Amino acid sequence: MINITSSASQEGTRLNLICTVWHKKEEAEGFVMFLCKDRSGDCSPETSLKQLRLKRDPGIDGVGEISSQLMFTISQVTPLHSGTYQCCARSQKSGIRLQGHFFSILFTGNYTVTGL
């Protein structure tokens, strides 16, 4: 794990929040990715909106040669989704964390995404 990048895509009423861990090709294993909303210092898999440990066989979505992806999908954005989000990842064995930058969704009955 070197670093985590954050992105977003949308179509119709649906918004996808995307976290991407970049890593060496031989260091694809042994970390969990997760996305947290409005935590103050306790972002973990247990406090996350979504977590994922990816198995690296062919035919599985999110599996890259030097990257791994987590996608959290909001089918319809409501006021519940307004707030500040962060992508994180954690390796079990070595203890290391990586954090992404903070970004925000603001419900306005439309929405803006900022900080990406």
Swiss-Prot record:
Disulfide bonds join 19-87, 36-43. Glycans are attached at residues 3, 110. It comes from the Eukaryota. Residues 2-108 form the Ig-like V-type domain. It is found in: Cell membrane. Receptor on immune cells capable to deliver stimulatory or inhibitory signals that regulate cell activation and differentiation. Exists as a GPI-anchored and as a transmembrane form, each likely initiating distinct signaling pathways via phosphoinositol 3-kinase in activated NK cells and via LCK and CD247/CD3 zeta chain in activated T cells. Receptor for both classical and non-classical MHC class I molecules. In the context of acute viral infection, recognizes HLA-C and triggers NK cell cytotoxic activity, likely playing a role in anti-viral innate immune response. The gene is CD160. It comes from Homo sapiens. It is a lipid-anchor; GPI-anchor. The chain holds residues 27 to 143 of 181 of the full protein. This is CD160 antigen.
